[PDB]
From a paper:
Desensitization of these ‘non-NMDA’ receptors involves rearrangement of a dimer formed by neighbouring ligand-binding domains (LBDs). The [name] is a clam-shell structure comprising an ‘upper’ (D1) and ‘lower’ (D2) lobe, with ligands bound between the two lobes, and the [name] dimer is formed by contacts across D1 lobes. Specifically, in KARs, additional contacts are formed at the dimer apex (grey surface), including a chloride ion bound on the twofold symmetry axis and two sodium ions bound on either side.
In the third mutant, [name], the second basic residue forming the anion binding site was also truncated to alanine. Truncation of the side chain had the opposite effect, attenuating both the rate and extent of desensitization. Responses of [name] [name] to Glu and KA exhibited slower rates of desensitization compared with [name] WT, along with steady-state responses of similar magnitude to those observed in [name] K531A. The interface-anion also appeared to be absent from the [name]:Glu and :KA [name] structures. While electron density was visible above K531, anomalous difference-Fourier electron density maps indicated this was solvent rather than chloride. In addition, for [name]:Glu, the region of negative potential extended significantly beyond the cation binding pocket, potentially masking the anion binding site from the solvent. Whereas the sodium binding sites can be seen as two discrete regions of negative potential in [name] WT, the negative potential extends across the dimer interface in [name]. The surprising point remains that this loss of chloride is the only change apparent in [name] [name], a mutant with attenuated desensitization. Comparing the interface conformations in the three apical mutants with those of the equivalent [name] WT complexes, movements were observed with K531A and K531A-T779G, but not with [name]. A possible explanation is that in the apical mutants the charge balance in this region (zero, counting 2× aspartate plus either 2x lysine or 2x arginine as appropriate) is actually more favourable to dimer stability than that in [name] WT (+1; 2× lysine, 2× arginine, 2× aspartate and 1× Cl−).
Numbering used by the authors:
A (entry chain B): 432 to 544, 555, 566, 667 to 799, 804
B (entry chain A): 432 to 544, 555, 566, 667 to 800, 804
Write the structure that this text describes.
C-alpha cells in the first residue's frame, strides 16, 4: 500500500465537505485526488493519502543544503508518491524523479482588471504596487535564480521585502490581491481557477516560462515510468480533460 | 559519437539552401538542429545526423506487430537518439524511452478562413468537405483508437477513404488545404507556423488533445534522463523560448 504525500491547494486537493465526519482517503477531493484514484485503477495499487507535515512544496536551503516539503518526504523515502500540483524543475529532477507531465503551465501575474499594468516589466519599474510569490516554491526559485534583468530586478525587490511580500500559500496571495494593492506571481493553471471565480481579477501579460506538473517519486523508483504510461493513457482517452473541466464570470 | 535519426519537417528540420553542395551535418538546419546542438554542448557528445530511411515517424502494424519510422530505428538500436517533432504517446512509450517534453501541443484543424466550420463535430457530421491526416502518425493513431463517438466517426470516414484523404507528410496536407475543399488534422505548433505564412488559412476550433514532443531513445538508455535534465536547463534559462521564436517568426 503506497504512501502518497500531497498538499492542500484548490482545486487540486481540498477537504471534502460532509455533514458527518469523514475518514481516510474519503476526507479529500479535487483534480489530483481523481487523478490518484484513476492511477490506482490502472496500475492496481492501494494507497493512503497524507498531507505533508510542514505544508511546503519543496526547496533547498542555501545555507545547509537541506530540502523541505514534499520533495524532502520523497528523498527520505517517507512517501512513495507525491500527487499534487508539483512543478517539474531542473533542481528537483536532480534529487527525485517525476512522471511525465499531466498538466502544462507557466508563471504569470494575478492582479485586478482595468489597471495600467500590462506586464512583469511594468511591475519591476515601480514600487507603489507591491508584488510577491509563494515562499519556498518553484515560482520563488525561478526569480531567485534568474539572470534576466527584469526578473533579477523583481527578485531584488521581493527579497528586500521578504517578510512583507512573500506568502506561505497561494490562498494567502490571492487574499492579498483581493484586499490590498498587490500583484501575485503564480502559476497559470491556478490563475485560471481564481479568475473564473473572482470576476474583478485577471491574468496580466502572458506566461513568463513553461513547465509541467508531474507525479513525484524517490529517485530510481520504478513507479515514475509506470505512472507516465498511465497518464498517457488517461490523457489519450480524454479523462484528464474531463477532470480539468469538472474542477475548473 | 551518437547516431541521431530525424525527419524533414519545416521548421524543425530542413535542408539548408546552398549553391555549394554541403556534406554531413552541415546539410541540416532548424529548430530541432539547434536543439541538438545545444544538447551536444551540455552533455558533451558528438554526433552524426541521418534521416530516417523510410521517411516515417513510427507506427505499429496492427496485423504483424512490426514498427516503422524513427521508432523502429530506436527499437532496433540503429540510432542512439531521435531528435525531431516526435510525439510522446502511450503506445510508443511502451517500446522506446523519451526525454520529458521540449514542446507541448495538441491535435487541431487547419482549414480556410471565413467558413461556418467551427469544430471537429462540424466536420464529422458532413461529407462534402473531405478531411484527413498524416498516415501512420500520432494524429491518425489518436483517431484510430479513440472511444469518443465524434472521433470514432471521423476515423471511420478517414480509414474508408485512406487512398484519397490520408497524406504522406504535413507538406502534402497543407497543399491539399490550399488547392481543394479539404481540412487537415495536424499538430497545433505546426499549424501556428503555417498560419503565420498563409493569411487565408486558420486553426479551426481548439486543441482536441494534449501531448509533448520529446527526444526518443532506445528503452533503458541512460540518455533519456540526461536529456530531460538538459532540456529543463534550456527551458529555465529561456533558450527553448528563443529557439521557438527564431524558427516560427499577417
Ligand atoms: N506548484 C509550485 C508551488 C506554487 C508556486 O511556486 O507558485 C511548486 O511546485 O513549487
Ligand atoms: N508529430 C507526429 C506526426 C505528425 C502528425 O501525426 O500529425 C508524430 O510524432 O507521429
Ligand atoms: Na531525477
Ligand atoms: Na518507455
Amino acid at each position: 500500500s503506497l504512501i502518497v504525500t500531497t498538499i492542500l491547494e484548490e482545486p487540486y486537493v481540498l477537504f471534502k465537505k460532509s455533514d458527518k465526519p469523514l475518514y481516510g482517503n474519503d476526507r479529500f477531493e479535487g483534480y489530483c485526488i481523481d487523478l490518484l484514484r484513476e492511477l490506482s485503477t490502472i496500475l492496481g495499487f492501494t494507497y493512503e493519502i497524507r498531507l505533508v507535515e510542514d505544508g511546503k512544496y519543496g526547496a533547498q536551503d542555501d545555507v545547509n543544503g537541506q530540502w523541505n516539503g514534499m520533495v524532502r518526504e520523497l528523498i527520505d523515502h517517507k512517501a512513495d508518491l507525491a500527487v499534487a500540483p508539483l512543478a517539474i524543475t531542473y533542481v528537483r529532477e536532480k534529487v527525485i524523479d517525476f512522471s511525465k507531465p499531466f498538466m502544462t503551465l507557466g508563471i504569470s501575474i494575478l492582479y485586478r482588471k482595468g489597471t495600467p499594468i500590462d506586464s512583469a516589466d511594468d511591475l519591476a519599474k515601480q514600487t507603489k504596487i507591491e508584488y510577491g510569490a509563494v515562499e519556498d516554491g518553484a515560482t520563488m526559485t525561478f526569480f531567485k535564480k534568474s539572470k534576466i534583468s527584469t526578473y533579477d530586478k523583481m527578485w531584488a525587490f521581493m527579497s528586500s521585502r521578504r517578510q512583507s511580500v512573500l506568502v506561505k500559500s497561494n490562498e494567502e496571495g490571492i487574499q492579498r490581491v483581493l484586499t490590498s494593492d498587490y500583484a501575485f506571481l503564480m502559476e497559470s493553471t491556478t490563475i485560471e481557477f481564481v479568475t473564473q471565480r473572482n470576476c474583478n481579477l485577471t491574468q496580466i501579460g502572458g506566461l513568463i516560462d513553461s513547465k509541467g506538473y508531474g507525479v513525484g517519486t524517490p529517485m530510481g523508483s520504478p513507479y515514475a515510468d509506470k505512472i507516465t504510461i498511465a497518464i498517457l493513457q488517461l490523457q489519450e482517452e480524454g479523462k484528464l480533460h474531463m477532470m480539468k473541466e469538472k474542477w475548473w464570470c
